[PDB]
């Protein structure tokens, strides 16, 4: 597998890189970034080489300016972590204007190269998703954006250490924003394949708390650790795994939907979707409580609200 | 880890050596047989070291008799699968009779050398692992069986490969008696988290066939293949997997129930159980449905008659 | 990846279907036997399944008989395991079997074939003939297996892991076989750098390794997980272009002093394009030379 | 298995925790650092658990106090990285001494609570891992260090690299000081188990060029990317693994030399040595060329200078 990652400079585009290039299907890893950083990437190649000694794996790593983008033709995917943090007084549509521009120009120029997947990280994820799509002219089956991918899976852990079960052994799910107009679906939440509504500590289970705590996880992390990396990139490398090996499962990605669902339409959002070789090859119609169904048609609003004023930017 | 296979020679034993000890935390294998079998088992141990070349692992692997079992001492398990085989004429209850002397000998004499796990798999499983609870003297968890867990695998596959989805992704439960009175838990069944009830194709799921196909499916192996060795080796591992790294699972097991479900006690018979590091370390109480449940005791009901005549012969 | 097994119905077919699925790269693997068998490899296909469950993989296992093999189109290797007597006898037979299936292959699609079927320096000539195929496409198991068996031979007596030991027996997959110790290391570390090669029992150890087959077969009736194993090794090679120098079954074309137009066991570069080259290495005089005789006998029968 | 990192803030220290949790054998992960750096280790501990999460892993992960290790009893591992960084005017000798009081504290709290192995990380790292031995009291099989283990494995990757293989099929070793004095050993460079000294380009190889990379390696990606995190985790995760299922394995690391070579005695110097469960259960006896084992010896002879002078520096 070909994978470009632009903006393997950053915290989590170096993580994945790293975690990327010592998958045995990872054959051909491509570290892009502006030039300034390019003796930066020159040394996390060296650094990802001496861990490919130690795992005793191999690939192709190369290191290039945002200038010679031939170096991602025939790329099987490329993901975009490349964007402006949020500092102290930018507010969310400022955010979401600049990284737009940024997103929106790499995925023009990811387009005029090859044909290729766009696999969006930056934030704000959902509206860089869809300008990604929209700058990129690809179909909606190869542009997808990371969601509330992370929010679920950090759900999944907070729900599995209070039910005393392994991490794997719970699959909850959050779709809507990648913010704080998420909806947790208890509805789809089950652990070892019994809805967690069949035990008899979901009754005690502290869902309000837990919902609260995964909403400001981010922040969280962005005091304590100055931002994540590891899960985020570990993120990445599950949803490239299901795509290299073409796994067709339902994961939970930031995606286009035109009316899967009641209402949500024209919107880049998180939704239930069916990842494979061909990237999103389905967006999963699912049934939804009233109060999942409602708060999803309102965040899907905001998502559209934010969406506009980049579309054209 | 430390595991012995009590009829290694047999077809699902000599495949579940082989799958254990290509695993890095299988460390020392112990395979034991009666003595005509030394020869076999011996030629099995040579045949295994080509293999741990190729994959690049290496284990211990010993051979003994059924007669010296002290080998056997300080094993984290021991998987028995010795028993006669069913043939023409011969009822259930024959060789539940027939069998439950067999392991129940060789539980007696686990119980002589060491205090372990065993890990019965011989049929009728359910009746074996009474036996076995009741002749080693160990608590009750130590001692559990296979029971549903290779039927709940292929009602597994069989609902995820009809809903398109790796086979990962389906995570379904087949409880009560390894033979006609199991009951599935369309309760328990999920597709990503997400109860299969909540899906379009449903209602179009044809229930009534699979499950015809589950109950089936290994009078068809044993047709056409001559019998089962691979998938039953690979629910082995599994379970030998999860008591090696402390996976506190919800697995389906063949184990004692003492009252965790309505009108279910003093039987071994296949539920849902919480495996980790010491065995079955809780049996998962859950809410099943008015018809599951009320299969799941009649399945115990028959369980717990052939349990009644086995118990002390 | 597609992968096809010719022989599937087998033991070593069956037990090898079985290691392939069970990878991630594996995602269509076609079992291929004749039609009394049709019966039998869909039972294995069942099996595998339920295996497929226990270790949570997936694949597309197909089953299909011998008289339609356009299933076998657009495979990146084709395993081939179909196959009083005298070694010419076995040699013989076996060789219209090995042909007729490379010819058959050839006719469907531009593949790689792996030959398992024995003698498996002579087969795989024949494969490599009747195929049509470039030398790069076609090649056996050779002596993988006896270097391996060599490999925990010198391991086991040195207390090391058994990947830690790589030692290499290029030649025959038979009598002529010579083992290399000059190309034998622990660790990277050549085995004449330790104060045990002088006590190490080469002569007790190369006697169990040519009679290793055989004590298998009076034994357990045959060898069926390390032979897969070693198969998956292969494969996997492929797959991921794995430039990797293993020890395996090839045509030669003058890449050693005087042996030459002949399959046999060689040192050589496995890669995505199936043996990339045969490497060319220095052999003590010894062994040079009892390559040389095992190279005449090999193509004696060839 | 029980693993503490002691210095997870630092940067190799975080890579290692995230390498090691994401392991099926690693069930407890005892993450310690100063007080001040208990915050970042908290999130760190929350970066971990998102990453099992998409691995499907799981582990126990604890957070601590340089002040509170009884969270370390049972450890079957404590991985030392916390030591000062190396700055401009500090010379090697400065930073030796400083990194050995770090260091020898740590040995000496570690075996004031339990009895297990030391794998010590921080430079100068031979002679850390010597006052690490000294310090700790612990048999000479449980304290060793990763010495030039690495500086193996970029050696391995440039050999493979130039003829063509896989880095997993190159198994060269670089034995001596982890820093200038190092001698990497030719005699044991193979290459699919043949020694490359049986190839054609063996006599093409650009020796020189590729130790004298290898050599400035280190600087360099101080220099690029400001340290090392991913790859000195790595080979730290290997020797875990190698320990934790007795994999009896021939591996170049740090560990007290008393003789196994020709006059070099007295000093920890990167040896070959065979890991299993015991830690280093042996110092391999191996032939080395006449230029090998008199640069090992010289390499040992300045190793046994920087430890004389910290061996009694509390
Ligand atoms: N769940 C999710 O979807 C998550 C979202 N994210 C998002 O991903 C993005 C990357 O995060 P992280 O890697 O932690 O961030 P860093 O700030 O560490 O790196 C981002 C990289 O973007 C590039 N960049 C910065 N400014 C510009 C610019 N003005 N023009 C072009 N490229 C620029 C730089 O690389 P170079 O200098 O080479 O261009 C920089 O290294 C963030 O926006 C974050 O919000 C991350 C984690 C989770
Ligand atoms: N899902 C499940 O729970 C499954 C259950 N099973 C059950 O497990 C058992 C083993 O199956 P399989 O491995 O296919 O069977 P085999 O008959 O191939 O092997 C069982 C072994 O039992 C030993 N054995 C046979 N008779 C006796 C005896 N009278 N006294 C002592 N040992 C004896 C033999 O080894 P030796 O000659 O060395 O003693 C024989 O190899 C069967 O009863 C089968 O029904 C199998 C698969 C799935
Ligand atoms: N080191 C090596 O290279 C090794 C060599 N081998 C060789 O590979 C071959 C396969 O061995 P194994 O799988 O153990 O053998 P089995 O005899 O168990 O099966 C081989 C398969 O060959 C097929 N077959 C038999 N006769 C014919 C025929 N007349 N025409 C077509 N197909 C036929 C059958 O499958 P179907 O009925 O589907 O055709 C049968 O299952 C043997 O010759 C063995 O010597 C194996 C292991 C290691
Ligand atoms: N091949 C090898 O053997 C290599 C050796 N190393 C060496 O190991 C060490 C780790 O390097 P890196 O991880 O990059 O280092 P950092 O400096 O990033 O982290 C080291 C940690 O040590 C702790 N620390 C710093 N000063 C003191 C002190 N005075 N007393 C106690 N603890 C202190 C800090 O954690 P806290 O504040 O929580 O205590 C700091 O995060 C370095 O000395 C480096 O030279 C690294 C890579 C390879
Ligand atoms: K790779
Ligand atoms: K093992
Ligand atoms: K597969
Ligand atoms: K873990």
Known sequence: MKVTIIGASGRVGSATALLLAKESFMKDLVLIG???????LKGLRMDIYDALAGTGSDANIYVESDENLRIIDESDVVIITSGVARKEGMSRMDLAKTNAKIVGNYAK????????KIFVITNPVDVMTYKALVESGFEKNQVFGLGTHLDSLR????????FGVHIDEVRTRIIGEHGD????????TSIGGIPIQRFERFKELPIDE????????????????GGSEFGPAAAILNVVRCIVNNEKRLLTLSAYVDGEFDGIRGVCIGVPVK????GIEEVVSIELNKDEIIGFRKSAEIIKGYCEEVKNL
């Open 210 to 225: 837990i919902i609260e705590d995964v909403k400001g996880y981010g922040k969280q992390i962005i005091d304590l650790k």
């Open 181 to 188: 107009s998420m909806v947790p679906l208890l509805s789809a």
């Open 155 to 162: 759900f999944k852990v907070a729900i599995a250490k209070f």
């Open 109 to 116: 120029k990811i387009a005029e190269i090859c044909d290729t």
């Open 275 to 278: 990842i494979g070789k061909d």
């Open 34 to 40: 502006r030039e300034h950083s390019i003796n930066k």
